[PDB]
From a paper:
In this study, we present the crystal structure of a class-I KARI from the thermoacidophilic archaeon Sulfolobus acidocaldarius at 1.75-Å resolution. Gel filtration showed that in the presence of 2 mM Mg2+ Sac-KARI is a dimer with a molecular weight of ~70 kDa (the theoretical molecular weight of the dimer is ~74 kDa). Each monomer of Sac-KARI folds into an N-terminal Rossmann domain and a C-terminal “knot” domain. In addition, probably because of the presence of 2 mM magnesium in the lysis and purification buffers, a Mg2+ was seen in each active site, surrounded by the side chains of E227 and E231 of one monomer and D191 of another. Mg2+ (I) is coordinated by D191 and E195 and Mg2+ (II) by D191, E227 and E231. We believe that Sac-KARI shares an induced-fit mechanism in which the active site closes upon cofactor binding that is similar to that observed in the prokaryotic class I KARIs and plant class II KARIs but distinct from that of Ec-KARI. In conclusion, Sac-KARI is one of the rare enzymes that displays high activity at elevated temperatures, a board range of pH tolerance and is able to utilize both NADH and NADPH as co-factors.
Proteins of both classes fold into an N-terminal Rossmann domain and a C-terminal “knot” domain.
Author numbering:
A (entry chain B), B (entry chain A): 2 to 330
Write the structure that this text describes.
């Protein structure tokens, strides 16, 4: 697939545009800081004069209520939680849209699932950096940057890909590299990864391994080092060198064990259930169910966070993190 | 558990002893470099004059053939691959052992499974740091250190735990903290983590999720970012702030999906199969099976490595790491 880097993209297409960054969480901050450093006129737009508003004041912005930021801008960037974008949009963005304005997202969920339904006469596009806000910012600030995906949903102007690329350049992404996708692809793949692998899957895998050891009578601190803490070593090596690289770096005892037992533990029925999860994303069932849960108060999340907070593993983990911090220079 | 720090041991217990570090891979290097900085007399002993040998020379060591390092030393540290230790021991160490010498390990495997059966007149102990060699070295050299586990197998002197902690102090581990375990516990828990979690488990988990997306027709590059590359972001968060902190850092959508779908994918039958793997470790079946396999050339590893090296997943990953490399500061 085509990879775009600094050289392939001009800022001219957004240089003269006023950008509203809606939100000043971890992403909103990073983007607002990078855009402003790249010479883009940024207004931060916020629903409340709360902690976010203060943080933005602390960074030399003068924040505005959402609607005032929108009325004074050309390019509107939604860096708000997915579940509250709909309400902010309808009440504080929609009535202010004019021909030729742009709606810009970091995630495809709301557009793809019709929670925000834009008019036909604006451009709609996305830049999805592949790192946390702090890194997005740090790397840009050191003359590098983080890769991202870009997509266009509605290209009314004919320049929507160029504009998406320019935004991505202004936040440092083209220093690393950018690849084009679609709103649908980014949404479905992001939901799938989070559910089966990145958050759901690996958390349950690590937690089961930890529990198995503690239930068999081994020391909890030993069990935590072996099943949770060491995972960084492994995943750092995959990130840096691929699986091949990682496998070369571990013992032959580890390779033999991982190759023979790994597939018995994570067997074909797991893959079959991942297919089912993907089917549930693709049919819309997952998004329907989540929107329904959220509408009832997200009690699943509250109960699960309480269980994690009070678990044995969390207690043990805290203690080993004091030990690691104690020796970190 | 009791955590030991610098206040719990004086280097005096080993300051006057000559140490042979057998091997000069990433661990042998780190330990040799730290010990010498702590003012411990270090000799590097090696079976061949190849790359390890040259690196030791680069670091200012004059390396010796293994048996010459042993004859000239009091404390023999095995920092060699587990499956070669037995033959190095029989051929190059055991003939030269004398009362009061120490046999020191970084992993319990060879002592626990009777592949090395030490004589009755030596101490036998272990120090098992909980980070890669480079870090062992880096933190030490920066005035911190990395935590480790210690264990005693045969305490002929009555001071084996003091000597283990002293070696750990000399490589900086007591700057962070050290926990005592046993050779059995270290062995069984290290085998278990590699097999079901750290290597076997997570690799099968990530590959299967990649494969699911690719099979469904998503762009492989997108699939790789979402199922493999982004793992580092989550695991880093767990490493730094535990599961509660990771979960606070991800979206509510991610939380809900991980808590509901993750548990459907990684169900309690996975745990049950982890328990069977642990039973197979505990009975010695795994170790028998591996020792047998290794003695036949470890053809399982070679074919597994080829299969990984020419996988779609791996081809994709090569490209994307140029991207990231391209933007790091
Ligand atoms: Mg993502
Ligand atoms: Mg280990």
């Amino acid at each position: 697939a085509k990879i775009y880097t600094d050289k392939d993209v001009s800022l001219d297409v957004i240089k003269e545009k006023r950008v509203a960054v809606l939100g000043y969480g971890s992403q909103g901050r990073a983007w607002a800081l990078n855009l402003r450093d790249s010479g883009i006129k940024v207004s931060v737009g916020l629903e409340r004069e709360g902690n976010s508003w203060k943080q933005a004041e602390n960074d030399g912005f003068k924040p505005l209520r959402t609607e005032e930021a929108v009325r004074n801008s050309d390019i509107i960037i939604f860096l708000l939680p997915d579940m509250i974008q709909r309400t902010v949009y309808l009440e504080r963005v929609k009535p202010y849209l004019k021909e030729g304005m742009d709606l810009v997202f970091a995630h495809g969920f709301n557009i793809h699932y019709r929670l925000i339904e834009p008019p036909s006469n604006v451009d709609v596009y996305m830049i999805a950096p592949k790192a946390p806000g702090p890194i997005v910012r740090e790397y840009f600030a050191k003359g590098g940057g983080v890769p991202a995906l870009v997509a266009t949903y509605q290209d009314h102007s004919g320049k929507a890909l160029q504009k998406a690329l320019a935004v991505a350049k202004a936040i440092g992404a083209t220093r690393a590299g950018v690849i084009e996708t679609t709103f649908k692809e980014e949404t479905e793949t992001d939901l799938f990864g989070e559910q089966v692998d990145l958050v759901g899957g690996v958390m349950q895998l690590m937690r089961y391994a930890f529990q198995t050891l503690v239930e068999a009578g081994y020391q909890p601190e030993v069990a935590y080092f072996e099943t949770i803490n060491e995972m960084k070593l492994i995943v750092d090596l995959v990130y840096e060198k691929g699986f091949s690289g990682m496998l070369t770096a571990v013992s032959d005892t580890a390779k033999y064990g991982g190759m023979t037992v790994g597939k018995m533990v994570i067997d074909e029925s797991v893959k079959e259930r991942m297919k089912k999860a993907l089917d549930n994303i693709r049919s819309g069932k997952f998004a329907e169910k989540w929107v329904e849960e959220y509408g009832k108060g997200a009690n699943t999340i509250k109960e699960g966070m309480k269980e994690v907070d009070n678990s044995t593993e969390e207690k043990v983990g805290r203690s080993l993190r004091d030990i690691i911090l104690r020796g970190k220079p």
